[PDB]
Amino acid sequence: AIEWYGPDRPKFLGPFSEGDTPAYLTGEFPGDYGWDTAGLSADPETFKRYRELELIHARWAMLGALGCITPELLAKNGIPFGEAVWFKAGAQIFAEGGLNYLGNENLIHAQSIIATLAFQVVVMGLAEAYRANGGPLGEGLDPLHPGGAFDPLGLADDPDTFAELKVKEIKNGRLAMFSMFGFFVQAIVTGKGPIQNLDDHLANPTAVNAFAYATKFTPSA
């Protein structure tokens, strides 16, 4: 069981996964568990673009799953900055003094969403287009894992643990995408923060769960 590659590997149905795992999923990629029940990635070009899209979704979801928990995690310590939930965090731009980073007034404290939006558009278009094509840190390399200045700490060498950390990255990333979809729907249905949902679940699990909010979206008409 100590492998994430080869023909025999950990799979998404466990011991129920011999009749699954078709011929074009061979375990040659980080995170192959034989889950292609829909059959979306038969073509290896389609499979390559889906793997790239999945891994950049993994990176942005690992960024997001921590950036949504840290405002409520510093509201746990008692640092007050406007609002601690993530899905009502943008409106602090439109506050009486603007969105503050850590609440202390000598910090970022920007007020106009349109100017920082334009700055985000230009530098993120430049950075992501350098990610797709190439720029001043590597022109033609892997579209998945460039390295170079992306590994200043030297974890890209010794390629077996590079593959092992690739599987670790895609596993934590898939857990982060699952967590971020759960964050989205806990924001939609409950309307409170996810750490607040954790406090309400730890305070009373048996009556306050998702089935408590099961009758919310019932169409009355």
Partner 1 sequence: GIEFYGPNRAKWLGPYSENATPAYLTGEFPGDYGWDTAGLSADPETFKRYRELELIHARWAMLGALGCITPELLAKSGTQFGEAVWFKAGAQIFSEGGLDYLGNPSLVHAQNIVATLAVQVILMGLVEGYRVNGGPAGEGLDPLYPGESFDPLGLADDPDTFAELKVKEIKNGRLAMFSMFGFFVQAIVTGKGPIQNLDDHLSNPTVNNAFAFATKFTPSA
Residue ranges at the known binding site for chlorophyll b: 12, 57, 59-60, 90-91, 108, 111-112, 120, 128, 131, 135, 137-138, 217
Tell me the binding residues for chlorophyll a. 33-35, 41, 50, 54, 57, 92, 102, 112, 147, 168-169, 172, 174, 186, 190, 197, 201, 209-210
DSSP string, 108-129: -----HHHHHHHHHHHHHHHHH
Residue nearest to ligand CHL (CB): 90
Here the tokens at position 147 are: 């390295």
Contacts of 28 (CB under 8 A, 6+ apart): 5
Question: Which residue in 28, 215, 220, 221 binds ligand CHL (CB under 6 A)?
Answer: 215
* Contact region with ligand CLA (CB under 6 A), list: 44-52, 78-86, 101-109, 127-135: 44-52
Residue among 71 and 174 whose Cβ is closer to ligand CLA: 174
- The candidate with the shortest Cα–Cα distance to 51, out of 27, 22, 31, is 31
**Is 194:183 a contact under the CB 8 Å cutoff?**
yes
Closest CB 151 distance from ligand CHL, rounded Å: 26
**Is 47:162 a contact under the CB 8 Å cutoff?**
no
Neighbours of 221 (CB within 10 A): 3
Closest CB 1 distance from ligand CHL, rounded Å: 14
Contacts of 143 (CB under 8 A, 6+ apart): 52, 131, 132
Does 181 help bind ligand CLA (rule: CB under 6 A)? yes
Residues shown for the chain: 221
DSSP-assigned letter for residue 213: G
User: Could you list the residues that contact ligand CHL (CB under 6 A)?
Assistant: 87-91, 93, 113, 116-117, 120, 184, 187-188, 211, 214-215, 217-219
User: Could you list the residues that contact ligand CLA (CB under 6 A)?
Assistant: 12, 25, 29, 31-36, 40-41, 47, 50-51, 53-54, 57, 174, 177-178, 181
